[PDB]
Write a protein that binds this ligand. Structure first.
Ligand SMILES: [Mg+2]
Ligand SMILES: [Mg+2]
Lengths: 324, 318
């Protein structure tokens, strides 16, 4: 790891200042959700490190008081020119926090405001062990490991060594179902997403990818636990559900939600990490690999849906500059 | 006992165990959203205390390793019978974490599983200074004050002393707009909510109230700062936006998002904290009072909407 080395440098420099006590992940768009696994990892595993996950806009208007020499700030920007994210790195450096930047473009303006820069694999055919989300997690595993010890580091590196094969085989495996999925939902206008736990970020991104295909109403990305309380999303609209079924410690919540939806006869596309072979990653760390699986399989489904859908030229279609 | 005394007993009791290092807020449904401000408070203000906000089902299936003698867990259930929340209190005591319970029902099962119980004001004419969201926050302000010190404790107490009158006055103030809102939106099926910062919880809860009236599609509750980066929730559905315009540190984020929506000719109902008298609270602490304000003014709009308008008969968990 580049990350192992980076964190080792940071842990050395800040020792005299009282150590790393706080980690802040800061990004917008698809870079924000990509750090959700790092946030979930530190919340689950840490005893003496705090973690905060911020949109760049909220961070620079309302930075925490702990921002200082005992904080590390990890910023991400695919192209390295998001103005709010650059200001975050700058505000961090002016408070004496070391900044790690994550970017595809090493020339970018962002780089000039980072103490350390890490890049990632990108595009069709990429190695998943080196992708943006995995680098964000590796920052968290190395900060924990090098400050207080991480009981399951070797299981984790075992996981990193398996995820790429798992994902490539999963994408092949969903191909026929994706086609059928496309025919079944090509005439819907709105679809809900459901998820829980450390892969939720991937579901949130998928909810926005569906929105970008369907372009009608941006629907709620429902946490699985929330069906059992108060209102639930079953009405005369007959909206279908795109259901992220996780491996790991929140699988029991997901199963309870899936059974609920089944008792109401809903239309549900289930995408099950267990059915896609995640289960060879050990129980200790499998929660943290859900995101990399789903986020790299959903494009197969999204491509099929797009291709199954053609629009009259009388229908206005929208495009955006989306932040990877 | 009240929060000040309850926290003193905890600091005393965990003194010889390493003291209190982590706070977990754990609830479901409306009680989850109600602890958003507490979480926001500790993440902004604490240098040495960690904070987590969990739904009970998540917490009981995936509890943090730091759950133990240096954690305080604050659980809330209005009727004190939500099973997941009770299980959360029990798991927390079994790990040796002091458990503070918030409930309206003082003989609920939940009380059997907490070390301390606090209650709150509820119902029309309640004192806002004692409402559930405010006891959540006060738990956080006392935890911070008695462990680490808090620079704005007195400003905070001042805010607490003002919020009741601010709220009941704002309720009267919006009454006529609420009627006009109900007429402009009575034929819509879906409406988005938009908010930022320490009061996001109240917008989330409003998203759920709108859906309970409209009963078509549960739409996104949009963070203001996500309208700076595409994609944007602007389509030919022409969905309107119920916009929570906060006072305090993220008011500039809100203002940018509102100007964007205006530039796009969207249909927007603006509820503005600065228009509704919140600005009497010191800017050092005003972020934390947005929730109490919006949460208590929304009902006026919601009742007007329902009046102006087979049904699903969902019950809310307060
Ligand atoms: Mg629900
Ligand atoms: Mg956006």
């Amino acid at each position: 790891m580049g990350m192992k080395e980076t964190v080792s440098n940071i842990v050395t420099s800040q020792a005299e200042k009282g150590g790393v006590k706080h980690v802040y992940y800061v990004a917008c768009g698809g870079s924000y959700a990509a750090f959700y696994p790092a946030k979930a990892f530190l919340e689950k595993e840490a005893k003496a490190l705090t973690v905060g996950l911020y949109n760049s806009g909220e961070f620079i208007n309302n930075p925490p008081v702990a921002l200082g020499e005992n904080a590390v700030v990890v910023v991400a920007s695919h192209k390295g020119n998001t103005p709010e994210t650059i200001k975050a790195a700058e505000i961090a450096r002016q408070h004496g926090a070391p900044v790690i930047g994550l970017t595809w473009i090493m020339d970018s303006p962002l780089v000039a405001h980072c103490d350390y820069v890490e890049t990632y694999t990108f595009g069709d055919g990429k190695d998943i062990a080196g992708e943006k989300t995995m680098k964000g997690l590796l920052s968290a595993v190395e900060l924990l490991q090098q400050t207080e010890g991480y009981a399951h580091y070797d299981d984790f590196q075992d996981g990193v060594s398996k995820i790429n094969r798992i994902v490539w085989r999963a994408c092949e495996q969903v191909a026929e179902r994706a086609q059928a999925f496309a025919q079944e939902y090509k005439d819907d206008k709105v679809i809900y997403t459901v998820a829980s736990g450390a892969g939720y970020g991937a579901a949130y991104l998928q909810s926005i990818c569906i929105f970008m295909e369907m372009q009608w109403i941006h629907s709620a990305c429902i946490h699985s636990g929330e069906f059992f309380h108060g209102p639930f999303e079953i009405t005369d609209a007959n909206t279908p559900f795109f259901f992220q079924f996780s491996e790991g410690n929140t699988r029991a919540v997901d199963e309870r939600a899936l059974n609920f939806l089944k008792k109401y006869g809903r239309r549900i596309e289930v995408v099950d990490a267990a059915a896609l072979g995640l289960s060879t990653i050990k129980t200790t760390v499998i929660d943290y690999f859900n995101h990399s699986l789903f986020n790299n399989v959903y494009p197969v489904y999204n491509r099929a849906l797009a291709e199954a859908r053609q629009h009259p030229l009388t229908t206005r279609r929208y495009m955006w500059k989306v932040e990877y």
